[PDB]
Amino acid sequence: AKKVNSEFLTLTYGALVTQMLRDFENAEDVNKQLERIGYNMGMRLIEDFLARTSAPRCLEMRETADRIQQAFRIYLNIQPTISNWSPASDEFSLVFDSNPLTEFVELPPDLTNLRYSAILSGCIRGALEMVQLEVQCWFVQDQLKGDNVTELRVKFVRRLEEVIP
Amino acid sequence: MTIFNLYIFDKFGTLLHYAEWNRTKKSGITREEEAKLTYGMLFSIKSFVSKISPHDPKEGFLYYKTNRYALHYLETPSGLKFVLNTDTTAINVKELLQQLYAKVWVEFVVRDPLWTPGTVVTSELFQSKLDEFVRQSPIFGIRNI
Amino acid sequence: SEEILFDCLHAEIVNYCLDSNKEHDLATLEYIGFTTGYRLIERLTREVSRFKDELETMKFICTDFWMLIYKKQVDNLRTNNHGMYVVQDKAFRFLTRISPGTKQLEHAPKFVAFTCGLVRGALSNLGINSTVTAEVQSIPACKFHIEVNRN
Amino acid sequence: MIIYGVYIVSKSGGLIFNLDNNVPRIEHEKTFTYPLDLVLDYDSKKVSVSFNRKDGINVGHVLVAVNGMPVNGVTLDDGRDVRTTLDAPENYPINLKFSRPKMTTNEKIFLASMFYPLFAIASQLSPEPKSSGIEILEADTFTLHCFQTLTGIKFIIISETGLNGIDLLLRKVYELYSDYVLKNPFYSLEMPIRCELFDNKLQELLAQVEKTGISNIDK
């Protein structure tokens, strides 16, 4: 019994999105502020993830995908199928058969533009600017939007390097 | 392993935190300029070891040892820097500093809502946890490799 | 373990500090969360009788919930002369992350609000009937007094 | 096992003697295709890669000569730009030749110049009192041994991580330093070392240290 410890985040995040909604009617506010708070979140968890894994750093793209799928595996307990590889291979698609942030919130959030993975964006984004990766993120497909399966698409841009020590 | 003192600096280069247990020689210059001098110390060391190494630096610099003390270093992939300092004789302290990082600093800095990155870490709770954690196996020495 | 996700997410729960509501979170988080906790409760040691009533103290469900959630049961669990009562803990899990100095009390009640306004039951001490306020005198020592919503 | 670069610096710190042991820097080759996974980021005449490391390629690793055409700065020897060929897909697949940028003489001079005050100012206000500057540095792939002769000369030799007894090698190079400075007072105490005698006797020392055993102190 009491196997699943974590079905409380799918409803904590639900409370977040509902109250952000009731505060600001705009569908994109509850996306961007939610993304920046999930960004600080990613800052806060990448430190512990590297504390356990002791990975050197994401100097390469495939190893970065491995580290990120490992991060999802350890905390959010989902297996990101790394697919859709670009010929330049600067980008890769994360295939989540089951959303880990939610467990069946519902397919209609009554209205579109309600980006339901903004923390996930922070989850993927924040760590990068902490592991020194100036990287852009965006979602190519969301099963929650009436779709079969959720794919994310994250594009590294500039190797963040420390300056003027 | 009881040690002289520990330094924690953010990737930007500010003094996140300092800890002292055995530092005997008390400097005359301020420990702030001392912290900045240590950070320049470390970054220029990293450049030196990166460039004069004939083979790929995976984690770069490890430590330096002197006549009378020794200094040990830890680079996080986050860019955070830990540095410890003590006398000579002990187990290698790379895993020691890693254990301190994971078990204490991650536990009692990052997890604190009061802790906001980009600032100093001032909390008696973390000072305690760090103190008793160094006092966990606290004989002495380094001889780090 | 799966604790740091909730710890950080709750830190951001605090973080948005809009100047409208002392409840950064509404009792909705409560309802859904202990509804999942009730999913955990598919067995409870309460009799099957339709003709007889047996009460499941909210104290016991509170402590088992806490082991499932906060992972440290009550240290003081006092039954007030009313139908209400009070819970006192020398330490709190979210408060273990901070020193005992009284600097920002107001966060901790928002933390523990997760046990406030819970979807009730009919009988006294029946498991979930919860109207409660947080009155914390010491930083680790979190105190919470319930008030019977009816009467 | 070998002593990678034996150096020495004056009180001012100018690298006196860039005694390089035979050090084969790794050369990599690969026949690449249409525009690349490799980060062909241009950085100040150093057409290198920062991200997307594959096949034992490091950040420093820089193209030397596509199909045996050495690069001048950023351009082709024939005068086309690197990216000029990068945009052109007809020649593909094309053979890129990567090597880590080999530290030239002036590079090593600048490296020692920038290094010197580090050791000189090495935690001057260190926690332990009456201490010295950095005596031994140990890195990911090498270990530097710096030995001050209590004033003036700093013997700086970089050896393998697992190597032991390097202090004795410092002793012998101290001996041979004396055996050299025997001859030329017009060789200033801060002029760079230019003498083939020191060179050949240190080649003998290298041949010895191919063998670990140092005895009757081995030269």
Author numbering:
A (entry chain C): 10 to 174
B (entry chain E): 1 to 145
C (entry chain D): 2 to 152
D (entry chain F): 1 to 219
What does the paper say about this structure?
We report a cryo‐EM structure of the entire Drosophila TRAPPIII complex. The TRAPPIII‐specific subunits TRAPPC8 and TRAPPC11 hold the catalytic core like a pair of tongs, with TRAPPC12 and TRAPPC13 positioned at the joint between them.
The C‐terminal halves of these subunits, along with TRAPPC12 and TRAPPC13, were unmodelled as although helices were recognisable in many regions, the sequences could not be attributed. The primary interactions between the core and the arms are via binding of TRAPPC2 and TRAPPC2L to TRAPPC8 and TRAPPC11, respectively. TRAPPC8 is linked to density formed by the connection of the first two α‐helices of TRAPPC3b and TRAPPC5. Similarly, density from TRAPPC11 connects to a region formed by the first two α‐helices of TRAPPC3a and TRAPPC6. We detected 146 total cross‐links, and 75 of them mapped to residues present in the structural model—32 cross‐links were inter‐molecular and 43 intra‐molecular. None of these cross‐links exceeded the maximum distance constraint for disuccinimidyl dibutyric urea (DSBU) of ~30 Å, thus providing good validation for the atomic model of the TRAPPIII complex (Appendix Fig S5B and Table EV1).
